[PDB]
PDB file of all heavy atoms in Angstrom:
ATOM      1  N   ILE A   1      -2.117  -5.790   1.990  1.00  0.00           N
ATOM      2  CA  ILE A   1      -2.005  -4.977   3.134  1.00  0.00           C
ATOM      3  C   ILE A   1      -1.521  -5.905   4.272  1.00  0.00           C
ATOM      4  O   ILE A   1      -0.535  -5.513   4.911  1.00  0.00           O
ATOM      5  CB  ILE A   1      -3.422  -4.260   3.444  1.00  0.00           C
ATOM      6  CG1 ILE A   1      -3.479  -3.211   2.467  1.00  0.00           C
ATOM      7  CG2 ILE A   1      -3.336  -3.729   4.875  1.00  0.00           C
ATOM      8  CD1 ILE A   1      -2.174  -3.004   1.596  1.00  0.00           C
ATOM      9  N   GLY A   2      -2.177  -7.027   4.475  1.00  0.00           N
ATOM     10  CA  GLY A   2      -1.742  -7.924   5.419  1.00  0.00           C
ATOM     11  C   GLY A   2      -2.528  -7.720   6.710  1.00  0.00           C
ATOM     12  O   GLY A   2      -1.902  -7.264   7.703  1.00  0.00           O
ATOM     13  N   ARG A   3      -3.716  -7.734   6.459  1.00  0.00           N
ATOM     14  CA  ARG A   3      -4.687  -7.578   7.497  1.00  0.00           C
ATOM     15  C   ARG A   3      -6.018  -7.582   6.650  1.00  0.00           C
ATOM     16  O   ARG A   3      -6.031  -7.381   5.470  1.00  0.00           O
ATOM     17  CB  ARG A   3      -4.416  -6.118   8.094  1.00  0.00           C
ATOM     18  CG  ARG A   3      -4.759  -4.920   7.252  1.00  0.00           C
ATOM     19  CD  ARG A   3      -5.266  -3.743   8.066  1.00  0.00           C
ATOM     20  NE  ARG A   3      -5.163  -2.381   7.434  1.00  0.00           N
ATOM     21  CZ  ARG A   3      -6.256  -1.585   7.229  1.00  0.00           C
ATOM     22  NH1 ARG A   3      -7.488  -1.992   7.392  1.00  0.00           N
ATOM     23  NH2 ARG A   3      -6.032  -0.269   6.660  1.00  0.00           N
ATOM     24  N   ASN A   4      -7.103  -7.665   7.377  1.00  0.00           N
ATOM     25  CA  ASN A   4      -8.454  -7.508   6.757  1.00  0.00           C
ATOM     26  C   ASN A   4      -8.744  -6.162   6.744  1.00  0.00           C
ATOM     27  O   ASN A   4      -8.518  -5.420   7.666  1.00  0.00           O
ATOM     28  CB  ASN A   4      -9.547  -8.423   7.186  1.00  0.00           C
ATOM     29  CG  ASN A   4      -9.374  -9.031   8.575  1.00  0.00           C
ATOM     30  OD1 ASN A   4      -9.534  -8.431   9.551  1.00  0.00           O
ATOM     31  ND2 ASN A   4      -9.093 -10.301   8.546  1.00  0.00           N
ATOM     32  N   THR A   5      -9.102  -5.629   5.521  1.00  0.00           N
ATOM     33  CA  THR A   5      -9.312  -4.260   5.172  1.00  0.00           C
ATOM     34  C   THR A   5     -10.681  -3.907   4.790  1.00  0.00           C
ATOM     35  O   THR A   5     -10.976  -2.676   4.635  1.00  0.00           O
ATOM     36  CB  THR A   5      -8.513  -3.800   3.957  1.00  0.00           C
ATOM     37  OG1 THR A   5      -9.040  -4.576   2.898  1.00  0.00           O
ATOM     38  CG2 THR A   5      -7.057  -3.898   4.102  1.00  0.00           C
ATOM     39  N   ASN A   6     -11.586  -4.867   4.623  1.00  0.00           N
ATOM     40  CA  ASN A   6     -12.964  -4.659   4.181  1.00  0.00           C
ATOM     41  C   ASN A   6     -12.853  -3.681   2.980  1.00  0.00           C
ATOM     42  O   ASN A   6     -13.803  -2.772   2.915  1.00  0.00           O
ATOM     43  CB  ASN A   6     -13.956  -4.358   5.156  1.00  0.00           C
ATOM     44  CG  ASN A   6     -15.231  -5.252   4.866  1.00  0.00           C
ATOM     45  OD1 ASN A   6     -15.220  -6.404   4.695  1.00  0.00           O
ATOM     46  ND2 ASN A   6     -16.471  -4.489   4.769  1.00  0.00           N
ATOM     47  N   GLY A   7     -11.940  -3.815   2.163  1.00  0.00           N
ATOM     48  CA  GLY A   7     -11.609  -2.884   1.032  1.00  0.00           C
ATOM     49  C   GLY A   7     -11.284  -1.439   1.341  1.00  0.00           C
ATOM     50  O   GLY A   7     -11.390  -0.624   0.355  1.00  0.00           O
ATOM     51  N   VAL A   8     -10.850  -1.085   2.527  1.00  0.00           N
ATOM     52  CA  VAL A   8     -10.593   0.334   3.006  1.00  0.00           C
ATOM     53  C   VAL A   8      -9.181   0.510   3.498  1.00  0.00           C
ATOM     54  O   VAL A   8      -8.732  -0.249   4.285  1.00  0.00           O
ATOM     55  CB  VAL A   8     -11.665   0.797   3.806  1.00  0.00           C
ATOM     56  CG1 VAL A   8     -11.612   2.296   3.956  1.00  0.00           C
ATOM     57  CG2 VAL A   8     -12.943   0.531   3.036  1.00  0.00           C
ATOM     58  N   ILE A   9      -8.352   1.447   2.938  1.00  0.00           N
ATOM     59  CA  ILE A   9      -7.042   1.590   3.391  1.00  0.00           C
ATOM     60  C   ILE A   9      -6.613   2.932   3.823  1.00  0.00           C
ATOM     61  O   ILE A   9      -7.377   3.885   3.777  1.00  0.00           O
ATOM     62  CB  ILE A   9      -6.021   0.986   2.354  1.00  0.00           C
ATOM     63  CG1 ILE A   9      -5.891   1.998   1.191  1.00  0.00           C
ATOM     64  CG2 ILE A   9      -6.535  -0.456   1.893  1.00  0.00           C
ATOM     65  CD1 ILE A   9      -4.469   1.937   0.554  1.00  0.00           C
ATOM     66  N   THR A  10      -5.459   2.989   4.471  1.00  0.00           N
ATOM     67  CA  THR A  10      -4.930   4.230   4.901  1.00  0.00           C
ATOM     68  C   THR A  10      -3.813   4.809   3.919  1.00  0.00           C
ATOM     69  O   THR A  10      -3.145   4.021   3.130  1.00  0.00           O
ATOM     70  CB  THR A  10      -4.170   3.916   6.207  1.00  0.00           C
ATOM     71  OG1 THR A  10      -3.151   2.850   6.030  1.00  0.00           O
ATOM     72  CG2 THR A  10      -5.140   3.489   7.235  1.00  0.00           C
ATOM     73  N   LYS A  11      -3.643   6.074   4.143  1.00  0.00           N
ATOM     74  CA  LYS A  11      -2.659   6.847   3.309  1.00  0.00           C
ATOM     75  C   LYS A  11      -1.302   6.097   3.301  1.00  0.00           C
ATOM     76  O   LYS A  11      -0.632   5.858   2.353  1.00  0.00           O
ATOM     77  CB  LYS A  11      -2.432   8.167   3.991  1.00  0.00           C
ATOM     78  CG  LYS A  11      -1.813   9.414   3.083  1.00  0.00           C
ATOM     79  CD  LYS A  11      -2.919  10.438   2.970  1.00  0.00           C
ATOM     80  CE  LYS A  11      -2.474  11.768   2.904  1.00  0.00           C
ATOM     81  NZ  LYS A  11      -3.164  12.670   1.803  1.00  0.00           N
ATOM     82  N   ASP A  12      -1.171   5.730   4.607  1.00  0.00           N
ATOM     83  CA  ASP A  12       0.075   4.996   4.855  1.00  0.00           C
ATOM     84  C   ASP A  12       0.240   3.780   4.139  1.00  0.00           C
ATOM     85  O   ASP A  12       1.313   3.470   3.713  1.00  0.00           O
ATOM     86  CB  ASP A  12       0.009   4.808   6.478  1.00  0.00           C
ATOM     87  CG  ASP A  12       0.529   6.102   7.130  1.00  0.00           C
ATOM     88  OD1 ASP A  12       0.146   7.237   6.743  1.00  0.00           O
ATOM     89  OD2 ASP A  12       1.589   5.809   7.735  1.00  0.00           O
ATOM     90  N   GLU A  13      -0.852   2.947   4.027  1.00  0.00           N
ATOM     91  CA  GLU A  13      -0.862   1.757   3.285  1.00  0.00           C
ATOM     92  C   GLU A  13      -0.698   2.006   1.830  1.00  0.00           C
ATOM     93  O   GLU A  13       0.221   1.413   1.170  1.00  0.00           O
ATOM     94  CB  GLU A  13      -2.094   0.878   3.697  1.00  0.00           C
ATOM     95  CG  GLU A  13      -2.128   0.448   5.247  1.00  0.00           C
ATOM     96  CD  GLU A  13      -3.383  -0.023   5.578  1.00  0.00           C
ATOM     97  OE1 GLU A  13      -4.541   0.120   4.969  1.00  0.00           O
ATOM     98  OE2 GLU A  13      -3.386  -0.644   6.763  1.00  0.00           O
ATOM     99  N   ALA A  14      -1.369   2.954   1.297  1.00  0.00           N
ATOM    100  CA  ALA A  14      -1.263   3.274  -0.083  1.00  0.00           C
ATOM    101  C   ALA A  14       0.190   3.544  -0.431  1.00  0.00           C
ATOM    102  O   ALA A  14       0.677   3.130  -1.462  1.00  0.00           O
ATOM    103  CB  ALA A  14      -2.263   4.375  -0.392  1.00  0.00           C
ATOM    104  N   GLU A  15       0.765   4.471   0.381  1.00  0.00           N
ATOM    105  CA  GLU A  15       2.160   4.936   0.175  1.00  0.00           C
ATOM    106  C   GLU A  15       3.221   3.943   0.217  1.00  0.00           C
ATOM    107  O   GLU A  15       4.307   4.098  -0.440  1.00  0.00           O
ATOM    108  CB  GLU A  15       2.390   6.045   1.184  1.00  0.00           C
ATOM    109  CG  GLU A  15       1.671   7.313   0.837  1.00  0.00           C
ATOM    110  CD  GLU A  15       2.173   7.970  -0.515  1.00  0.00           C
ATOM    111  OE1 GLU A  15       3.076   7.426  -1.034  1.00  0.00           O
ATOM    112  OE2 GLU A  15       1.519   9.024  -0.803  1.00  0.00           O
ATOM    113  N   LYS A  16       3.007   2.879   0.945  1.00  0.00           N
ATOM    114  CA  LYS A  16       3.949   1.901   1.074  1.00  0.00           C
ATOM    115  C   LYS A  16       3.877   0.836  -0.050  1.00  0.00           C
ATOM    116  O   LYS A  16       4.767   0.263  -0.432  1.00  0.00           O
ATOM    117  CB  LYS A  16       4.083   1.303   2.444  1.00  0.00           C
ATOM    118  CG  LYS A  16       4.281  -0.267   2.337  1.00  0.00           C
ATOM    119  CD  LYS A  16       3.123  -1.102   2.957  1.00  0.00           C
ATOM    120  CE  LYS A  16       3.755  -2.405   3.499  1.00  0.00           C
ATOM    121  NZ  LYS A  16       3.003  -2.760   4.725  1.00  0.00           N
ATOM    122  N   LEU A  17       2.639   0.779  -0.437  1.00  0.00           N
ATOM    123  CA  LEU A  17       2.306  -0.174  -1.549  1.00  0.00           C
ATOM    124  C   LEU A  17       2.871   0.462  -2.708  1.00  0.00           C
ATOM    125  O   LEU A  17       3.275  -0.107  -3.670  1.00  0.00           O
ATOM    126  CB  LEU A  17       0.866  -0.184  -1.726  1.00  0.00           C
ATOM    127  CG  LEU A  17       0.278  -1.381  -1.239  1.00  0.00           C
ATOM    128  CD1 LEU A  17      -0.918  -1.524  -2.224  1.00  0.00           C
ATOM    129  CD2 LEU A  17       1.342  -2.439  -1.597  1.00  0.00           C
ATOM    130  N   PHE A  18       2.684   1.940  -2.662  1.00  0.00           N
ATOM    131  CA  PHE A  18       3.135   2.753  -3.822  1.00  0.00           C
ATOM    132  C   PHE A  18       4.598   2.519  -3.983  1.00  0.00           C
ATOM    133  O   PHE A  18       5.091   2.443  -5.028  1.00  0.00           O
ATOM    134  CB  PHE A  18       2.721   4.140  -3.592  1.00  0.00           C
ATOM    135  CG  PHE A  18       3.127   5.251  -4.676  1.00  0.00           C
ATOM    136  CD1 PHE A  18       3.235   4.766  -5.966  1.00  0.00           C
ATOM    137  CD2 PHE A  18       3.368   6.585  -4.513  1.00  0.00           C
ATOM    138  CE1 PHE A  18       3.553   5.530  -7.133  1.00  0.00           C
ATOM    139  CE2 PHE A  18       3.679   7.413  -5.485  1.00  0.00           C
ATOM    140  CZ  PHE A  18       3.752   6.970  -6.891  1.00  0.00           C
ATOM    141  N   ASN A  19       5.334   2.481  -2.914  1.00  0.00           N
ATOM    142  CA  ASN A  19       6.818   2.275  -2.916  1.00  0.00           C
ATOM    143  C   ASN A  19       7.101   1.046  -3.662  1.00  0.00           C
ATOM    144  O   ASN A  19       8.067   0.891  -4.350  1.00  0.00           O
ATOM    145  CB  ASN A  19       7.267   2.292  -1.519  1.00  0.00           C
ATOM    146  CG  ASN A  19       8.791   2.312  -1.234  1.00  0.00           C
ATOM    147  OD1 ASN A  19       9.370   1.529  -0.411  1.00  0.00           O
ATOM    148  ND2 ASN A  19       9.553   3.054  -2.094  1.00  0.00           N
ATOM    149  N   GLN A  20       6.436   0.016  -3.342  1.00  0.00           N
ATOM    150  CA  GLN A  20       6.759  -1.266  -3.785  1.00  0.00           C
ATOM    151  C   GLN A  20       6.579  -1.461  -5.283  1.00  0.00           C
ATOM    152  O   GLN A  20       7.426  -2.009  -6.004  1.00  0.00           O
ATOM    153  CB  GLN A  20       6.014  -2.493  -3.119  1.00  0.00           C
ATOM    154  CG  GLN A  20       5.581  -2.386  -1.698  1.00  0.00           C
ATOM    155  CD  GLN A  20       4.665  -3.528  -1.265  1.00  0.00           C
ATOM    156  OE1 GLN A  20       4.551  -3.840  -0.077  1.00  0.00           O
ATOM    157  NE2 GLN A  20       4.268  -4.345  -2.198  1.00  0.00           N
ATOM    158  N   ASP A  21       5.501  -0.831  -5.735  1.00  0.00           N
ATOM    159  CA  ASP A  21       5.011  -0.993  -7.043  1.00  0.00           C
ATOM    160  C   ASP A  21       6.006  -0.323  -7.860  1.00  0.00           C
ATOM    161  O   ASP A  21       6.484  -0.947  -8.968  1.00  0.00           O
ATOM    162  CB  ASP A  21       3.745  -0.121  -7.253  1.00  0.00           C
ATOM    163  CG  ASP A  21       2.460  -0.906  -7.032  1.00  0.00           C
ATOM    164  OD1 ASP A  21       2.546  -2.029  -6.474  1.00  0.00           O
ATOM    165  OD2 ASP A  21       1.388  -0.144  -6.945  1.00  0.00           O
ATOM    166  N   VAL A  22       6.522   0.777  -7.485  1.00  0.00           N
ATOM    167  CA  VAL A  22       7.531   1.395  -8.258  1.00  0.00           C
ATOM    168  C   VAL A  22       8.837   0.613  -8.374  1.00  0.00           C
ATOM    169  O   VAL A  22       9.418   0.301  -9.464  1.00  0.00           O
ATOM    170  CB  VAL A  22       7.928   2.725  -7.563  1.00  0.00           C
ATOM    171  CG1 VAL A  22       9.110   3.198  -8.359  1.00  0.00           C
ATOM    172  CG2 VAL A  22       6.726   3.697  -7.965  1.00  0.00           C
ATOM    173  N   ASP A  23       9.308   0.164  -7.197  1.00  0.00           N
ATOM    174  CA  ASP A  23      10.537  -0.637  -7.230  1.00  0.00           C
ATOM    175  C   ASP A  23      10.323  -1.851  -8.048  1.00  0.00           C
ATOM    176  O   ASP A  23      11.208  -2.113  -8.819  1.00  0.00           O
ATOM    177  CB  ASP A  23      10.965  -0.903  -5.663  1.00  0.00           C
ATOM    178  CG  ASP A  23      11.950  -1.857  -5.497  1.00  0.00           C
ATOM    179  OD1 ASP A  23      13.148  -1.653  -5.483  1.00  0.00           O
ATOM    180  OD2 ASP A  23      11.460  -3.083  -5.115  1.00  0.00           O
ATOM    181  N   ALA A  24       9.183  -2.374  -7.971  1.00  0.00           N
ATOM    182  CA  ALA A  24       8.789  -3.442  -8.864  1.00  0.00           C
ATOM    183  C   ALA A  24       8.987  -3.184 -10.209  1.00  0.00           C
ATOM    184  O   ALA A  24       9.458  -3.868 -11.155  1.00  0.00           O
ATOM    185  CB  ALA A  24       7.324  -3.870  -8.536  1.00  0.00           C
ATOM    186  N   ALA A  25       8.511  -1.909 -10.534  1.00  0.00           N
ATOM    187  CA  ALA A  25       8.529  -1.450 -11.872  1.00  0.00           C
ATOM    188  C   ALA A  25       9.970  -1.428 -12.187  1.00  0.00           C
ATOM    189  O   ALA A  25      10.355  -2.124 -13.275  1.00  0.00           O
ATOM    190  CB  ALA A  25       8.027   0.073 -11.846  1.00  0.00           C
ATOM    191  N   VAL A  26      10.687  -0.659 -11.301  1.00  0.00           N
ATOM    192  CA  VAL A  26      12.165  -0.480 -11.646  1.00  0.00           C
ATOM    193  C   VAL A  26      12.831  -1.641 -11.918  1.00  0.00           C
ATOM    194  O   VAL A  26      13.804  -1.556 -12.748  1.00  0.00           O
ATOM    195  CB  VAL A  26      12.705   0.354 -10.537  1.00  0.00           C
ATOM    196  CG1 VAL A  26      14.207   0.521 -10.924  1.00  0.00           C
ATOM    197  CG2 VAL A  26      12.181   1.731 -10.430  1.00  0.00           C
TER     198      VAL A  26
END
């Protein structure tokens, strides 16, 4: 995330990580 999250995230964060993952996949 690139911040301290205390293990809690935003939709926003999930979605962007989601994008990366995929591309990574790709």
Side-chain angles (χ1 to χ4, degrees):
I1 286 352
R3 76 149 160 113
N4 10 86
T5 64
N6 223 54
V8 192
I9 73 148
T10 54
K11 201 113 146 138
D12 276 53
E13 294 164 349
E15 284 294 355
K16 140 241 210 144
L17 249 213
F18 184 23
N19 184 217
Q20 331 174 162
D21 277 5
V22 171
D23 166 84
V26 181

